[PDB]
């Protein structure tokens, strides 16, 4: 269970495993809010999240807020 915060403060919640990549998280965010995968950017501890990496590669565990920033 991990939160996906936004600048508006629309704290949408996600349920994904530690072994799940950020690619999946982009696809799961797609399911929630209709937003293409290459136009999202997810921040945690002031650190950028890559596609290839998983939540285990970074230090993301549980109840973790994930700040979303879109691009035009």
């Amino acid at each position: 269970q991990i939160f996906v915060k936004t600048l508006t403060g629309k704290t949408i919640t996600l349920e994904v495993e530690p072994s799940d990549t950020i690619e999946n998280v982009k696809a799961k965010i797609q399911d929630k809010e209709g937003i293409p995968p290459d136009q999202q950017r997810l921040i945690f501890a002031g650190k950028q999240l890559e596609d290839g990496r998983t939540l285990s590669d970074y230090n993301i565990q549980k109840e973790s807020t994930l700040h979303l920033v879109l691009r035009l």
């Binding site: 915060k5 936004t6 600048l7 508006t8 403060g9 629309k10 950017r41 921040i43 945690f44 501890a45 002031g46 650190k47 807020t65 700040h67 979303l68 920033v69 879109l70 691009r71 035009l72």
Partner: protein, 43 residues
């Protein structure tokens, strides 16, 4: 017909006052990086 500009502008206007992007994708990655990074790091 669908949406030209005014109904996209009239909204775009009102978020800038409310300093908020992802409701209507208003602000830029530039400014949102600042907030998200300032938030994520401090939080």
């Amino acid at each position: 017909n669908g949406l030209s500009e005014d109904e996209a502008l009239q909204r775009a206007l009102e978020l800038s006052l409310a300093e908020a992007k992802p409701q209507v994708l208003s602000s830029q990655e530039e400014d949102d990086l600042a907030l998200a990074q300032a938030l994520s790091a401090s939080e």
